[PDB]
Amino acid sequence: SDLPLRFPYGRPEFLGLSQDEVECSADHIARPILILKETRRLPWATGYAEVINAGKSTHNEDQASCEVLTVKVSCHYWSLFDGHAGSGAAVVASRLLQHHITEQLQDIVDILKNIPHECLVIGALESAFKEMDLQIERERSSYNISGGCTALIVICLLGKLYVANAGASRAIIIRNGEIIPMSSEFTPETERQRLQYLAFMQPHLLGNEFTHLEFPRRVQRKELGKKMLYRDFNMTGWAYKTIEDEDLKFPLIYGEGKKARVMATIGVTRGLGDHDLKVHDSNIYIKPFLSSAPEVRIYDLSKYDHGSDDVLILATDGLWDVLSNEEVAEAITQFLPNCDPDDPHRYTLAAQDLVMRARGVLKDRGWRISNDRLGSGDDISVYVIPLIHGN
Amino acid sequence: LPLRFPYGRPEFLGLSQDEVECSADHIARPILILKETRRLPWATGYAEVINAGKSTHNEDQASCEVLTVKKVSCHYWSLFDGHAGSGAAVVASRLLQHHITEQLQDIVDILKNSAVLPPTFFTEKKIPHECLVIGALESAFKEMDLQIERERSSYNISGGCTALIVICLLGKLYVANAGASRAIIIRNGEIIPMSSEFTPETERQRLQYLAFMQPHLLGNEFTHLEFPRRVQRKELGKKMLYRDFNMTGWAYKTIEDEDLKFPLIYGEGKKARVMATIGVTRGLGDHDLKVHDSNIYIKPFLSSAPEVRIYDLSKYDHGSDDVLILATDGLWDVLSNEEVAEAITQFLPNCDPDDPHRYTLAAQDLVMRARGVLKDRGWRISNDRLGSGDDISVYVIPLIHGN
Ligand SMILES: [Mg+2]
Ligand SMILES: [Mg+2]
Ligand SMILES: [Mg+2]
Ligand SMILES: [Mg+2]
Numbered sequence: 038s039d040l041p042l043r044f045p046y047g048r049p050e051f052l053g054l055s056q057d058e059v060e061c062s063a064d065h066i067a068r069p070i071l072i073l074k075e076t077r078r079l080p081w082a083t084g085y086a087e088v089i090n091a092g093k094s095t096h097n098e099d100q101a102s103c104e105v106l107t108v109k110v111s112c113h114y115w116s117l118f119d120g121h122a123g124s125g126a127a128v129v130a131s132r133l134l135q136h137h138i139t140e141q142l143q144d145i146v147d148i149l150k151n152i153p154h155e156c157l158v159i160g161a162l163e164s165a166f167k168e169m170d171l172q173i174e175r176e177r178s179s180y181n182i183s184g185g186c187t188a189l190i191v192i193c194l195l196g197k198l199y200v201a202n203a204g205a206s207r208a209i210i211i212r213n214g215e216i217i218p219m220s221s222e223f224t225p226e227t228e229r230q231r232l233q234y235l236a237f238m239q240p241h242l243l244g245n246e247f248t249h250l251e252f253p254r255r256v257q258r259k260e261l262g263k264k265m266l267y268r269d270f271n272m273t274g275w276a277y278k279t280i281e282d283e284d285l286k287f288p289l290i291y292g293e294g295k296k297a298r299v300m301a302t303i304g305v306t307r308g309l310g311d312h313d314l315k316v317h318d319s320n321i322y323i324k325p326f327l328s329s330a331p332e333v334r335i336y337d338l339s340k341y342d343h344g345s346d347d348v349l350i351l352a353t354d355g356l357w358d359v360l361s362n363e364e365v366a367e368a369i370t371q372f373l374p375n376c377d378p379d380d381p382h383r384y385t386l387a388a389q390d391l392v393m394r395a396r397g398v399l400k401d402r403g404w405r406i407s408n409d410r411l412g413s414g415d416d417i418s419v420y421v422i423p424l425i426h427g428n
Numbered sequence: 429l430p431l432r433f434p435y436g437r438p439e440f441l442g443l444s445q446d447e448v449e450c451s452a453d454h455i456a457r458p459i460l461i462l463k464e465t466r467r468l469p470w471a472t473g474y475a476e477v478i479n480a481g482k483s484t485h486n487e488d489q490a491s492c493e494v495l496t497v498k499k500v501s502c503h504y505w506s507l508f509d510g511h512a513g514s515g516a517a518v519v520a521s522r523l524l525q526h527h528i529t530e531q532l533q534d535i536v537d538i539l540k541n542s543a544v545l546p547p548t549f550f551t552e553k554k555i556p557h558e559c560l561v562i563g564a565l566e567s568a569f570k571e572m573d574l575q576i577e578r579e580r581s582s583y584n585i586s587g588g589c590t591a592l593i594v595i596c597l598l599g600k601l602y603v604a605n606a607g608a609s610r611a612i613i614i615r616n617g618e619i620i621p622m623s624s625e626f627t628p629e630t631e632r633q634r635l636q637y638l639a640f641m642q643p644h645l646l647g648n649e650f651t652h653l654e655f656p657r658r659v660q661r662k663e664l665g666k667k668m669l670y671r672d673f674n675m676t677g678w679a680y681k682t683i684e685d686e687d688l689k690f691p692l693i694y695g696e697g698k699k700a701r702v703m704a705t706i707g708v709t710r711g712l713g714d715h716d717l718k719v720h721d722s723n724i725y726i727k728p729f730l731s732s733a734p735e736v737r738i739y740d741l742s743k744y745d746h747g748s749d750d751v752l753i754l755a756t757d758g759l760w761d762v763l764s765n766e767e768v769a770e771a772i773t774q775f776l777p778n779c780d781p782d783d784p785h786r787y788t789l790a791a792q793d794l795v796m797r798a799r800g801v802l803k804d805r806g807w808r809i810s811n812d813r814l815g816s817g818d819d820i821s822v823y824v825i826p827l828i829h830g831n
Contacts, residue, residue: 144667144680152656152669152678160677167674238641253546253553264534266546266555271570271733274562275555277534293553330674 043180084384091414123183126310185310233270338427355417473787473824480817513586516713588713626710636673741830758818
């Protein structure tokens, strides 16, 4: 907090917002939906829309970055970062991760003439994420790179899409109405076993304040000796255990779904930054359980002649927390057949339509969407990328 | 030290010990089948054959019985592929069913009702009945191992073994696997996999990560990194491809002395090895298994935890030919799921559907198609392919008895 910012906080550079415009966008009551000006066209006529959260942070902590890299060949790059505990990490990542990608790819650019080649691309991305973190880790001592962020990027390289995800953002393809998932989320519920095992193997990271076991609820001192249900790292099911003091510490993973936390602190298990993140008023470091390694899924743009409405949707959890893949698919396939297939603004409007269907409208009782469901109060950022440019 | 149990063949073969001797012939390789006089539960079929020479004993073991759980019926099939001795596989084939029975007794009352009970805002968590059975099996493997760990000092429980079991409990099948054996259901020609193998290839990242976290487990003779081939000293300083625990792809590294140690995982595929010793990563026993002439213990990298997959026998009215195949790697090392699927659906339509010996004949047919015939060019199967020289054990379980 004593250090200067590495970059000024801003919105994605491609929005071309002046800083009077940036202020007007930060409204928690009107929640203006920013879209991509028609004067500024993104690669592949990519559509983008975003909206600031309903009040839980003064800044929109999402960041987005979109440009065409050049490897000494062309490499298109889209990226989304969901910031938490500050905007520093996401801002930094949205400007620098592409250069770690470009440089890791330069190591193998020649070999990409003719171990499959795809596995070399995947390895470069995994190296780039590791190298983007670490740089945050070392420059942390010279700049205020606050907090951390999830990181979802995609590159088009020689006719294939690589979707690298480390966090809770999500990518799906809508190809002729059908949903092809391009990522899976990294939350305490989905990555329990890794965390529990690392706690079992290195129990000092639990700081005599947590247990690596998971129970159906909170265990009380009242209940010592009774047969309670437990789940260990090597288990997917549940069996009965007698409660033994150590079982009275706070569970390392507690909470059913979207409400589920690692050491009662963080609801996502992968991403960048958070290097000095510590437990709730404690001195236990969270980062030993966090990982900067992404999962990479490949889509080969050649196996199929895509249509005007065949799109890759990228969005932060702000979208997916209120909308299923099927609703998102419904909204796209309902909307895009109503815009002229030659309109370059066509996909930005689809991005806007999705954000609107997740943000909702403002009632006396809060933000509400369709069927009196509660709307998302998070930041929402949406990319609609038309696959037809990959044919 | 004495044996915990005598070496033998599966009890349901009713073999005398003269019959067991003639069965251990590495040249004739006789295919043993289930005598028609002895029916297994559900008229399950069984066949087996000894290896082509790599051990004097058939080191596979099998066990099949109907358990009774009391504070209900629980059908039980099991396969064990032993290595480095017969002791571990024998013990498990006699005792693991008792560990399953005992873990199930704790929850048997809960299981014949609705809702599971954690004892005996402010959110709780509901745990389905299936999740308690899964927890029992996982505990059972842990307890079967461990008992081997401690009784090891009083009896000669040699070696280790992989373990694939399946139980039928209240209309659901639970297939628990810890090793490289395999289970598939062949339902109306379609292949439903019910297991996945646990080998150095399939569990690379877990092993590398554990080696990274506790490098004392490598004793300065191995590196936790993987390379596309063996790293030579001549390549110190050069840019080579490597793969670490957090990677699915490959990137470039400078070779840095430590990268000259022996790879923790080496070998192309199924022929991949952990610390140059064992080609499977899960199962029982192996407690004093050490590295090739070393004092480094392997067991820290092995796991007795099984993967458990559930098949609901209620969702569909099975046919005479809808079967669950259990078999040791000896079958799958030369036969794909599709060949086995082809062979079952080709064979069974030729036996009367009420024939109780019908599925044993299919089991025998599968073993035959994997063992082959021996001329001069080796053991050869169809299309001049090289036959399996491992022990082979096959179960054909008719799913129709589960309707
Ligand atoms: Mg955020
Ligand atoms: Mg968020
Ligand atoms: Mg064997
Ligand atoms: Mg074998």
